[PDB]
Design an enzyme around this catalytic site. Sequence first.
Site, PDB file in Angstrom:
ATOM      1  N   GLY C  10       0.802  -1.204   0.000  1.00 19.15           N
ATOM      2  CA  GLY C  10       0.000   0.000   0.000  1.00 19.15           C
ATOM      3  C   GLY C  10       0.841   1.262   0.000  1.00 19.15           C
ATOM      4  O   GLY C  10       2.055   1.249   0.211  1.00 19.15           O
ATOM      5  N   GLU C  63      -0.333   0.289  -7.648  1.00 22.88           N
ATOM      6  CA  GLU C  63      -0.211   1.511  -8.423  1.00 22.88           C
ATOM      7  C   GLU C  63       1.208   1.662  -8.950  1.00 22.88           C
ATOM      8  O   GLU C  63       2.168   1.326  -8.250  1.00 22.88           O
ATOM      9  CB  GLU C  63      -0.563   2.750  -7.590  1.00 22.88           C
ATOM     10  CG  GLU C  63      -2.031   3.107  -7.586  1.00 22.88           C
ATOM     11  CD  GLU C  63      -2.337   4.298  -6.702  1.00 22.88           C
ATOM     12  OE1 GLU C  63      -1.434   4.736  -5.958  1.00 22.88           O
ATOM     13  OE2 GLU C  63      -3.481   4.797  -6.750  1.00 22.88           O
ATOM     14  N   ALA C  91      -6.740  -0.662  -6.301  1.00 24.68           N
ATOM     15  CA  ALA C  91      -7.966  -1.262  -5.805  1.00 24.68           C
ATOM     16  C   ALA C  91      -9.078  -0.250  -5.583  1.00 24.68           C
ATOM     17  O   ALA C  91     -10.220  -0.667  -5.360  1.00 24.68           O
ATOM     18  CB  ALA C  91      -7.714  -2.022  -4.495  1.00 24.68           C
ATOM     19  N   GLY C 136      -8.144   0.168   0.504  1.00 19.22           N
ATOM     20  CA  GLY C 136      -8.498  -1.135  -0.035  1.00 19.22           C
ATOM     21  C   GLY C 136      -7.296  -2.034  -0.257  1.00 19.22           C
ATOM     22  O   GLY C 136      -7.328  -3.218   0.087  1.00 19.22           O
ATOM     23  N   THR C 171      -9.877  10.542   5.682  1.00 22.47           N
ATOM     24  CA  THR C 171      -9.807  10.894   4.269  1.00 22.47           C
ATOM     25  C   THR C 171     -10.769  10.116   3.384  1.00 22.47           C
ATOM     26  O   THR C 171     -11.056  10.566   2.271  1.00 22.47           O
ATOM     27  CB  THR C 171      -8.387  10.674   3.727  1.00 22.47           C
ATOM     28  OG1 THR C 171      -8.089   9.272   3.730  1.00 22.47           O
ATOM     29  CG2 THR C 171      -7.370  11.401   4.585  1.00 22.47           C
ATOM     30  N   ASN C 198      -3.481   8.915  12.779  1.00 25.32           N
ATOM     31  CA  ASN C 198      -3.010  10.195  12.268  1.00 25.32           C
ATOM     32  C   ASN C 198      -3.341  11.347  13.209  1.00 25.32           C
ATOM     33  O   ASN C 198      -2.628  12.356  13.217  1.00 25.32           O
ATOM     34  CB  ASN C 198      -3.604  10.449  10.885  1.00 25.32           C
ATOM     35  CG  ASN C 198      -2.860   9.711   9.795  1.00 25.32           C
ATOM     36  OD1 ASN C 198      -2.126   8.763  10.065  1.00 25.32           O
ATOM     37  ND2 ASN C 198      -3.046  10.142   8.554  1.00 25.32           N
ATOM     38  N   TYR C 216       2.933  14.513   5.932  1.00 26.90           N
ATOM     39  CA  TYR C 216       3.114  13.063   5.961  1.00 26.90           C
ATOM     40  C   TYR C 216       4.571  12.637   5.828  1.00 26.90           C
ATOM     41  O   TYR C 216       4.881  11.469   6.074  1.00 26.90           O
ATOM     42  CB  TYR C 216       2.287  12.388   4.863  1.00 26.90           C
ATOM     43  CG  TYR C 216       0.798  12.249   5.123  1.00 26.90           C
ATOM     44  CD1 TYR C 216       0.102  13.164   5.902  1.00 26.90           C
ATOM     45  CD2 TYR C 216       0.086  11.191   4.574  1.00 26.90           C
ATOM     46  CE1 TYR C 216      -1.255  13.021   6.130  1.00 26.90           C
ATOM     47  CE2 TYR C 216      -1.271  11.038   4.799  1.00 26.90           C
ATOM     48  CZ  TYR C 216      -1.935  11.961   5.576  1.00 26.90           C
ATOM     49  OH  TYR C 216      -3.285  11.823   5.804  1.00 26.90           O
ATOM     50  N   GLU C 246      10.293 -13.070  22.324  1.00 29.55           N
ATOM     51  CA  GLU C 246      10.203 -12.824  23.759  1.00 29.55           C
ATOM     52  C   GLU C 246       9.018 -11.930  24.100  1.00 29.55           C
ATOM     53  O   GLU C 246       8.200 -12.274  24.960  1.00 29.55           O
ATOM     54  CB  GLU C 246      11.505 -12.209  24.273  1.00 29.55           C
ATOM     55  CG  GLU C 246      12.698 -13.143  24.213  1.00 29.55           C
ATOM     56  CD  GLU C 246      13.718 -12.864  25.297  1.00 29.55           C
ATOM     57  OE1 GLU C 246      14.862 -13.349  25.178  1.00 29.55           O
ATOM     58  OE2 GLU C 246      13.379 -12.150  26.264  1.00 29.55           O
TER      59      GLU C 246
END
Lengths: 272, 433, 431, 407
Positions: C10, C63, C91, C136, C171, C198, C216, C246
Site C-alpha cells: 500500500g 499503483e 484497488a 483497499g 480521508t 493520524n 506526511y 520474547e
Amino acid sequence: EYGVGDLIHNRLPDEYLRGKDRQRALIAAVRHHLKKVNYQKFDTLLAAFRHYDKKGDGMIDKDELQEACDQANLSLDDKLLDQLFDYCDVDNDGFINYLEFANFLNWKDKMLLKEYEERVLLIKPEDIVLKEAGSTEKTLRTLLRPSDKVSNYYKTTSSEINAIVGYPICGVPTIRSDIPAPRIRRISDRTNYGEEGSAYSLLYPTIFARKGVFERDFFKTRSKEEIAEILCNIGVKLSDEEFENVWNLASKKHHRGEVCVENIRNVLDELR
Amino acid sequence: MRECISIHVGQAGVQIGNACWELYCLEHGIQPDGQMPSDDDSFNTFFSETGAGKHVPRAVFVDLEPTVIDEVRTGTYRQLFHPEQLITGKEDAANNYARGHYTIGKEIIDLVLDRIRKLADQCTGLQGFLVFHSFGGGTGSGFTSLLMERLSVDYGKKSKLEFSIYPAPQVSTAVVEPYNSILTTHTTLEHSDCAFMVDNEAIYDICRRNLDIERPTYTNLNRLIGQIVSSITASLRFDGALNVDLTEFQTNLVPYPRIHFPLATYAPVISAEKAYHEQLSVAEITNACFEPANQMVKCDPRHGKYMACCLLYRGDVVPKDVNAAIATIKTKRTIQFVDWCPTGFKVGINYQPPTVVPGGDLAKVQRAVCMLSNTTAIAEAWARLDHKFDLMYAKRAFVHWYVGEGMEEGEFSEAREDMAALEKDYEEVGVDS
Amino acid sequence: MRECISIHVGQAGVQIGNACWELYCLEHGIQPDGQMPDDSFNTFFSETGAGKHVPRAVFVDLEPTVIDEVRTGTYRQLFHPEQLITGKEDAANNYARGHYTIGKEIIDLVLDRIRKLADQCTGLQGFLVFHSFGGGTGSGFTSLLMERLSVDYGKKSKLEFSIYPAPQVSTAVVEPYNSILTTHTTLEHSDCAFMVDNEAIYDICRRNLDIERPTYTNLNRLIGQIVSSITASLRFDGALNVDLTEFQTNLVPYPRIHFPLATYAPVISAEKAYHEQLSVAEITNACFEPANQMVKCDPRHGKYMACCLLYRGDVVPKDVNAAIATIKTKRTIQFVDWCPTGFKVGINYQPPTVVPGGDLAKVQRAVCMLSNTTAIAEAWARLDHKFDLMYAKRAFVHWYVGEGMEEGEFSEAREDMAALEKDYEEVGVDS
Amino acid sequence: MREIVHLQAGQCGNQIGAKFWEVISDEHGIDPTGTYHGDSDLQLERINVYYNEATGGKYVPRAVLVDLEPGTMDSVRSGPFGQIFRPDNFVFGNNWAKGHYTEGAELVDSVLDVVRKEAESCDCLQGFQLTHSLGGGTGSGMGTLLISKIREEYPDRIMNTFSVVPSPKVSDTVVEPYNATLSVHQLVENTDETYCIDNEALYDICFRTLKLTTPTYGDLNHLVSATMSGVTTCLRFPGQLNADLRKLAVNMVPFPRLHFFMPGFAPLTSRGSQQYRALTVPELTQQMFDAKNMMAACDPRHGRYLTVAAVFRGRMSMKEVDEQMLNVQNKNSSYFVEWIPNNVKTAVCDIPPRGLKMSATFIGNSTAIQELFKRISEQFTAMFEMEFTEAESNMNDLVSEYQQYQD
Ligand SMILES: Nc1nc2c(ncn2[C@@H]2O[C@H](COP(=O)(O)OP(=O)(O)OP(=O)(O)O)[C@@H](O)[C@H]2O)c(=O)[nH]1
Ligand SMILES: Nc1nc2c(ncn2[C@@H]2O[C@H](COP(=O)(O)OP(=O)(O)OP(=O)(O)O)[C@@H](O)[C@H]2O)c(=O)[nH]1
Ligand SMILES: Nc1nc2c(ncn2[C@@H]2O[C@H](COP(=O)(O)OP(=O)(O)O)[C@@H](O)[C@H]2O)c(=O)[nH]1
Ligand SMILES: [Mg+2]
Ligand SMILES: [Mg+2]
C-alpha cells in the site's frame, strides 16, 4: 500530383515520378542507341572518347553532345539534350568525364581495358578494379547514381549481427579473499576467508603450525627494530649495511605490505 | 583422442550452428581465419589441426536449399569451414516429408555418407553424433529420417545425440507441422539413443522475464541454445572433478529403450544489471532449475514425476555444496520422484567457468549449471500433438501433396498407432506399486 | 544469524517504508548506492561480493506512480530491480478489488519473492508487514497475503504496523467499512499488530516538536524510529536483549487480545532539549502521560494488562527499578488484579541517531513503550457505530458486491467484532 | 538455381507485367539500358531467377510478350522500361472464340517454341507466372490455351497466374460473364495458384486509405506489381525464415480445387498522416488484417478463412510476429475454421523494399470468394452450347464445395 509509387516508397517531393515516363523512355532510347552506335563504330573506348571530345579539353560539353548526336543521326530537342546531359553528369560539375561517359554512354564491359588504355590523366588510380574476383583482367569502376545507393538499405540480420571475431566478475567467490579476516571469529561465522589451509597441513603440521605461528603472522609487516631484534635473537648476525641492503631488497620485492617476514626470509635465502 | 562429430541439417539446425561454432572459437581462442594467435589438448573434440597450423572444425552442413548455406559461404566464417563439407542442393523440401526422404533426399545422401566416412577415418576415437534440426520443417523431418538408417547401419553402437526444435503448443510458423512431427518420431524411436528437446515459446518468455528483452530475435534464441550444447560437451574438452563422457550419461538417462526424450534447462540466465544485486551461490542456481517458470520446454513438471536427472555444473563449485543442495531438494514435497528410482541425480563438475559472448545479452557468472531431466510430464505434451493430428487427418486434408511423390497413405495410419503406444508407455511406467 | 523479512504493501506502507530505509542505512554507515566506504547489517542486508548490500525488503503495490518514484529517486541503486512489484488500476479503496479480482493476479509473484528471500536466510525471526486499515489495497491485499503465510510458514512471528483510522480526522468515506472486514480475517493469521493513528501524531507534532504544519513526510520519521527501536535489540549488543519471540509472548495474554499501543519518548526539538535535563526516571513518566499516547484514546478510561519498556542509550538498571516501582505505588495508573507483574525492561547500548534534515533532537537516551490496555474497547465501540449507521440503509454495498463479495460477509464480521467488544468486558471485570 | 518463366497475355496483363518489370528492376538496381548500378552485392547474388546475362553484363528479362494486336506491343516497347526486353520475345498477330479457336490457334506454335527454348536454356527451372485478365477475349482465350499446353508439357512444376477479375459496377464489356465462365473452366483444372485482382477494390483502396483524386491505370498496376514482387522476394533475397513458391503451395492448398487467393500490400499510408502514424509490426498486422485492404470485392466478415499467410520484409523480431498471429487468431476465433488448427503462416525476409523500413504482404485463402463466383454465375445465367452448361455446372460444383467445407 504524386501517384501511388511515391506514397508506397516514401519518396521526397523533389523526386516525384508522376509525369516523366515519356522523357525517361526517350532518354533510355537515345542512351541505348548511342551505346549501340559506339560499339558498332569504335573498337577502342579511348578512341570513342577522343572522337566525342572535338575541342580536346578532356571534357564533353552540351554543344559537343549536340554535334555528336547529329553525327550519330539523332534529332533531339534542347530540353531532351539538357535532361540527358544532367543524367550523364552525376558529379554536377557541368562536364562529362571519362568514367561516366564509359558508364552511361558506352558499353564498359564489352571492350576490355588494355595496356595502352592503362598507359594513357583521364583516369585515377582508384578508378581501376579487377573485372571479377580471382581474375587478372582489369576494368573500370562503376559510378553509382544517388537513387541507387542502398548500402544502408539492405543488410542481413542473422550473419551480420552474429559476426563476432575472437566488465569485472559479478557474484560471490567460494573463498572470500576480498573481505579481510576478522580479528576474532564469531561462533556463528562459517565463511572461508582462506586461512583454513590444506588437509596435509592440518594432518602433519610444520613447527610454526604446531606452536601457533601462521600465515597471518608471516605476512604481517613489522618495524625496523623489531626485525633487528628478531634477527639478533635468531643468531643470523648481519652488519648494518647488509641489514639495510636486505631491507631495501625486501621493500623492492613488493611495495605494498613491504618488509614482511616471508619477504625477508626469501631475500636472505636468495643472498645465501 | 576423444572426438565427436556434428551435423547441421535444415535451416533451424544450420542457423544454430552459426551461433554454436563461434562459441567454440571464443572458448579456445581460435580466430575466424582458422589459427591460434602467435602470442594443448582441449580443442581436439571439435577441431582438427592441419600441417600449416590452421584449425579445421568437424562439421557437415547439409541442406537442400542454397539460400541459407550460401549465407555461411559468404559470411564472416568463410575461411574456417571445409569447402567440401558445405553441401547444398536445389528447390528445398517445401515443408514436405515426401521431398526430404523419398524424391529429393536420395540425390544427396550418397555424397553425405562420403563426408562422414572421411571424418571417421581421421578420428583416433569416436564417441557420439550431434545432429541439429527441427521437427516442423520438411528438410528437418525428411532428411534426418533417412540419415540415421544409413548411419546406424554404417556404425553399429555409436551414441546419437540430437537437439531438436519441439513445435510449440500455441505459436507456429506452418500448418503441416503436426504432420511432419509424427512421421519423424516414428523413426527416431529405434534408431536414436537420446533426442533432447527444446521449443520456441518457452525461450521467448525466458527472454522477457529474466533478460528483460521485450523483442527477442532468432539471433538471441540461438545463442542461448548454443550455450547448452557447449555445456553438455564441456566435460569432453576440459578437466574437472566429475567428468562425464557421452556413453556414461546415456546409461543413466535411458531406463527403458523407448523412454529417451529428456529436457534441457540452463541456469542462471540474467541480465547485466541484476547480477550486481543478486548473490548467486551453489544452492540457488540448482534451485533455479526446478521452478515451473524456467523450463525450456512448454510443459508443467508438477503434473508428472521425474525419472532421472543430470546436473552438469561449470566453474568455481565444490562437491560438498552440490550434495547438500541435492538432499535439500529431495525433502521438498513439490518435486515428486518415482519410487522405483531412489537415486536419480547424477552430477558433473567442470573447472572452466562460462564464457561471455561480447555484445551479447547474457551476463558473465562464476558458475552455471545445465540440467537434463527425464520426466513423465511430456506425455501430455505429446497428447496435444496427437490431438492436432486427429482433427487434420479426419478429412484427409494436406494428403495429396504427400502422396504425389511416392509416399503411401498407409504410413500415416501406422505412425499414429505407434504414438498411441508411446503415450501409453508413459502411463505404464508412471503407475507405481 | 538473526534476520527478518520486511514487506511494504500500500501507499501508507511504502511511504513509511521509504522513510525507514534512510534510517536503517545511516545506522550502519552505508551510502544510498548500497556500498560501504561486524555483523550488525546481517539483520536487514545481504552482502554481495562486490561490496554491495541489498535490503531484505519487498515493495509491492498495485499503483505504478508510487513505486516509480523509488526507481527514479536517489535509492534506485539500492534495491533489487525486480523486488519492486507493480500492478495496475489499484484497488480504488475497495476491499473486494484487492482481495478477489486484482489481488489474485500478482500474489503468485509476491509470494515467490518471500520464498527466495527466506532461502538465503539461515535463521528467521519474523516478518514486518506495513499497511493501513483504511485503504483497499492496504487491507484487501494484506488479508490474502497473511492467510497464506500461515500455511506456508508454521509458527514464524508476524508483526504488523497499521495506521489506525482516527475518530475525528479521516480521508475516506468507506473507511469504516474496510477496517471491520480487515480485522475479521487478520485475527487468526497474526501474532502482534501495533497501531498508530493520524490524529494523535498531529498533536504530538504540535505541542512537543513545535511544528505548526505537520506533513506526511514528518510523521513517518517518528514511526520509523519506533520500528528502529524494536529491532535494535537484534542488531546491537546491550545489557538486556529482547528477541522478537520474547515480547510476542510477553504482550499477548489471550489469543484475541494482541493489539498493543506503541509510544515514544522523548520526542522534542533541538532548541527545547538544550534547556531540559533528560534522565531515566523522567522519560518513563512521560510514557504513561496521556498527552504523549500515540493512539487517540483515553488511558484513564481503561486498565492496563501488560507493558514493555525498551530503553536505549546510556541507561542503568538501578535507575529503571526506581522508575518502575514508583509507578506501581500510584493510584490512577491502574493495573488489573490478575496481573501482578506488568512490566518488561529492555536495555540497549547504542543511542538513536539523527537523519539530516530531521526534526528530532540528539538525546543520550530514548525509550519506546509497548502497552496493552483495555482503553481501546471504546475505540472499537465507536467504529462499530460508524459501521452500523451506513449499513442500516445498505449504502456503498453495491460496489463491494460487484467484484465477487456477497452480502452475508458484511453481517458475519459484525458479530465477530461484537464478540471482540465483549471479550474486553469479560476480562476487564475483576474477580 | 531456381527460375521462373514470365508470360504476358492481354493488354491489362501487358501493362501489369511491364510495371512488375520496372519494380523489380529498380529493386535489383538495373539500368533501363541493362547495366547494374547498386552498392549492395545482394542485388547480384540472385539475378538468374528473372534475368539472363547477355554478353557484356547486359541483363534481359525472361518473359514472353504475346498479343494479337500491334498497338499494345508498340505501347510496351515505347514505355519507360520497354527497351530492356528481348526483341525476339515480342510475338504479335474481343472474342474468346477468336482467342482460343480461330486466330489464337496458329500463334501458339511460335509461342510455345520460344517458351520451350527459354525453359531449355534454364538450369533447374522452378515455375511459371502468367499475367492476364479473365474478362478479355485475348487474355482469356490465349491465356487458358497457354496454361493447358504448359501444364501438358511440364507436369511437375509450380504455376502462378495473376488474373484481373470481373467487377459488378466498373465493368466495360458485355461478354464479360461469358468470358469469365469460359475461363474458370480451365483455371480450375490446370492451375496451382490463381491470384484474384479486382479493379473496383483497387479504386476503393486508392480512394479511401490513400486519398487519390485521379487514379491512373499505371497507379492501379503499381499496387498489384508491389504484391507480385512481395510474394516472390523469398526466392531472390535471403531471409530469417525462407519459404519459396512450393512451400507456399503445400501449406496453403488443402484440397486441389481450392487454390484461388486474395492478396494484399500492408504498409499503405497517404502523405497527410505519414508523420502521425508510426509503422511497426502490430499496426502492420492491423493494416493487413483490415478488411478495406483486401484486393477483391469480397467481404471477409461474411465467410471464413481457411489458410492465411504473411510474408514480411525488413529488420524485425519473430516473437512479435508470433504473438501478433496468435493474438489475432484468438480474438477472431469464429472467423477461422475449427478442423484446421494454426491457420496462420509467417515468413520473414531480411530485406525491405525500396524507400521503406519494413513491409507486409498478405495472402488469403477464404470462403469469401464464393460470392464472387455466384455473382458471375447469376450474371451469366440471365444472359444465357453444351460447354456453357458444363462450365456453369463446374462453377456450381466449386461454390458447393466451398459451402460444404465452410459448413
Ligand atoms: N531456434 C530456431 N528455430 C528456427 C530458426 N529458423 C527456423 N526455425 C524453426 O524451424 C521450424 C520449421 O523449419 P523451417 O524453418 O521450415 O526449416 P527446415 O526444417 O529446413 O524446413 P524447410 O525450410 O522447408 O527446408 C519453424 O517452426 C521454426 O520454429 C532459427 O533460426 N532458430
Ligand atoms: N502515517 C502515514 N499514513 C499515511 C501515509 N500515507 C497514507 N497514509 C494513510 O493511508 C490511508 C489510506 O491508504 P492509502 O495511502 O490511500 O493507500 P492504500 O491503503 O493502499 O489504499 P489505496 O490508495 O486505495 O490503494 C490514509 O487514510 C492515511 O491515513 C503516510 O505517509 N504516513
Ligand atoms: N489494372 C488495369 N486494368 C486494366 C487496364 N486496362 C484494362 N484493364 C481491365 O481489363 C478489362 C478489359 O480487358 P481487355 O483489355 O479487354 O482484355 P484483352 O482484350 O485481352 O486485352 C477491364 O475490365 C479493365 O478493368 C490497365 O491499364 N490496368
Ligand atoms: Mg529451409
Ligand atoms: Mg493506493
